[PDB]
Amino acid sequence: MTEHFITLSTTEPNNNIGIVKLRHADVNSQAIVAQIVENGQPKNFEGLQPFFCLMAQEATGQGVSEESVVSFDAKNGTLKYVASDNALQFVGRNEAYFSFRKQEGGRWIEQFSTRTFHYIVEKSIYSQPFKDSNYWWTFKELYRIFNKYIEDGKKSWEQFVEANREILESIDPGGVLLAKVIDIEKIVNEKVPAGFKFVLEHDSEYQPEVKVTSYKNAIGTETDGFDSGPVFGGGTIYNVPVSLSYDRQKVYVEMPKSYTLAGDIILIDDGTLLVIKETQVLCFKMSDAKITKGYVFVA
């Protein structure tokens, strides 16, 4: 992360010497590394909690801006302050300093502070107001509204399905049956290997293990040519559940209904075969044997 080095004094009359300039968009990166010096020697603030005090323009009160510094070495008089959301909120030319206070039971005992240094915040693309849909907006405003739409939208959809499922299932003695049978069906059409059957002819006299995978927009299968698809090199790979049955030099691979694909059968030099239908590819990987022929089961 980005660091800003300062050697702040408590005796030397600086008042304005020392400039730290940051940007508005700087969540947890820009940190201030400060050395505390009193009469030319490093100051030990042992027992006194360091505080980042900021004197913001047109945002003043009793507690203008005060944040406890977490990273610090009181023995050598060194501290590290990472600029917070509050610190970066005030865009413009501001003044800041570091306080050190010891308190008994709420009330203060001792409080010494360093000289003032300039703390200026440069406007970002996110701080600058912009015109959208005939109105003036800042990023923080829209980003909150858009994420609300997503959050409340997901919750309202979750409730939409929940309420609708209670209608046919909770209000009917035989309606419970209806939904459960439909629900159990697609599980069987996607996860259970039954609906699709493919035959793989081999050279081996034994039982070779077959592994099946399904993926779309694979290398050189995209509609508008090479690297035209949304996910380069293949999208999501699904490990197809299989039920294996064997005959002499024949492997019957049973797969779910959802993986039914009738396309071009391509045989590669080794124990690998593909079924390609435009963008959808079904891959067959066979161990300890060589594929000679591949075709969809029909008898």
């Binding site: 030397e12 009359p13 600086n14 008042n15 304005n16 010497i17």
Partner: peptide
């Protein structure tokens, strides 16, 4: 008062001094 083009001689402002 510290002007726009104020001079800081040896770390101290003369207008403050």
């Amino acid at each position: 008062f510290i002007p726009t083009s104020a001079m800081s001689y040896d770390g101290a402002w003369l207008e403050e001094l």
